[PDB]
Amino acid sequence: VIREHNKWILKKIRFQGNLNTKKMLNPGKLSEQLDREGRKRNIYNHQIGTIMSSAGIRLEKLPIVRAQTDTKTFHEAIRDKIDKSENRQNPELHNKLLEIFHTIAQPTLKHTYGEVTWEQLEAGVNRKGAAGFLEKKNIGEVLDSEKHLVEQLVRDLKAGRKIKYYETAIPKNEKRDVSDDWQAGDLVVEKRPRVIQYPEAKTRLAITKVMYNWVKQQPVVIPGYEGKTPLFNIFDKVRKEWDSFNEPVAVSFDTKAWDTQVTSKDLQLIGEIQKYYYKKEWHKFIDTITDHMTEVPVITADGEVYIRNGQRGSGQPDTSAGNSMLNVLTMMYAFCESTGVPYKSFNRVARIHVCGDDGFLITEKGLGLKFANKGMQILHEAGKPQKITEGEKMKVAYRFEDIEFCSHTPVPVRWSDNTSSHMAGRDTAVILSKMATRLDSSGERGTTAYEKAVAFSFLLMYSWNPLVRRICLLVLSQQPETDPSKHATYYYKGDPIGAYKDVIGRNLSELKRTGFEKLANLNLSLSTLGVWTKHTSKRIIQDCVAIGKEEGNWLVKPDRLISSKTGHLYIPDKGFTLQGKHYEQLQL
């Protein structure tokens, strides 16, 4: 019981309290917070957050917390992962790994790679790209002015000269999924930070500029490199391979802290593979740069300095390519050595998919489990320790939907024309989490021109999720005469629904059904964690109907269920899908 002149505060609570105070009342949390600089910004996306709160969705219950950027733990991070000797690896590992590479190399491109125009390096670049402990300017600023300094770096490197190489190590500030944790007792309030180790935004532009093709894997030369592959159509092509086996089994790759496991010889092996695709003139640039990465001096954000014995530095330009190639080769290596299947014969009995250290392969039940069992040991001595599990063997999948990749598994979808396909699935709880806390930082206070680009982006990815799909449609119904933001993953031109068709291949309205028992599972956590109420679904459905009832062409009617209830369809006008300020150019 609180005093009257104090109840006014209550008009502002928007979430249950988390203080867990025991002798002092803790009414609730407010919708806003305080900037690291004192300002008062929002926690979630307004439009989206509001719609979700309409139904019994409790934003405060979404498995999402921030990472601890404090130095105390930031150091505990370095000490717990990066502080390690290099993994002992069997002798011929790198010879036999190189051997496997040659069985997959394309002679057509051998020694054909060269430098690139500032005009393509500049394409899609994240300008606000870090600076480096001893560097004043960031990417963009370097691009604006010191563009010349970068050209001599390239020269000094091509000539294999002196270069004071070093990396800055800072804890990555970001919100992290804690779904698993909360699903079990551990109600963590925040999670350990990832240490980003990176070159100096000059040395970055220098390396990237000449090695654009390998790094940006334009001609994709890495077996099963799913890196430039949009996520919303990968399982369809993977379903193909699955269906091409008699008793298919999928085995996932689970290296514990990949980056932390790359050896010097691993880095050298990629150096070689790199020299295979680059013209002889650049081979010294590669040797010089590779030589430095074998032992890097690292300056932490607070001043400390450690001499890392070259593992991988997340901020290095060659992380995606390097890690991927190195991953496939090592997995291919392990597989063959476990089954006996000749290196050269891999593609005869197996199909592989890799994205960094993330990936899996598909083979017959026989070979597959022989690999999962003998792979633990073989990989371990190869220097890529697999996460220890109760099963004692690599994670095997006997069902297609049980295939996990890039934090997603295949969700079955039934189209109106009685055909099927699979989309990228994930626990709803998490989709909703990321959809509510993704705030774009084109710094801006965010529009409704950004929340639309986000909803559109989540539409392409999760149309198979009714709840999520409808939330998007509602957001997209707002302010029709205001184009979407380009600061989201994808954005659209013309009609959103028209655009959906553009990349998905089918129209939203043609989406007739979602695997019952798959969707069912992906919604289980929503209750365990009490994220929604037994009326949310109903409510969101009503929210939609309301809008699409009256005669007119409403973009909320592309949802079959809503359509049948309002009796109206939605006739799309053309639309086109596009990326925004990009990471790795997806080839849509």
Curated annotation (Swiss-Prot):
Positions contributing to GTP binding: 229, 231, 426, 434
Reaction(s) catalysed by this chain's protein: RNA(n) + a ribonucleoside 5'-triphosphate = RNA(n+1) + diphosphate
Glycosylation sites: 418, 507, 523
Residue span(s) of domain RdRp catalytic: 248-371
Function: Replicates the viral (+) and (-) genome. Initiates the primer-independent RNA replication via a de novo mechanism requiring GTP.
Name this protein carries in UniProt: RNA-directed RNA polymerase
Natural source organism: Bovine viral diarrhea virus (isolate NADL) (BVDV)
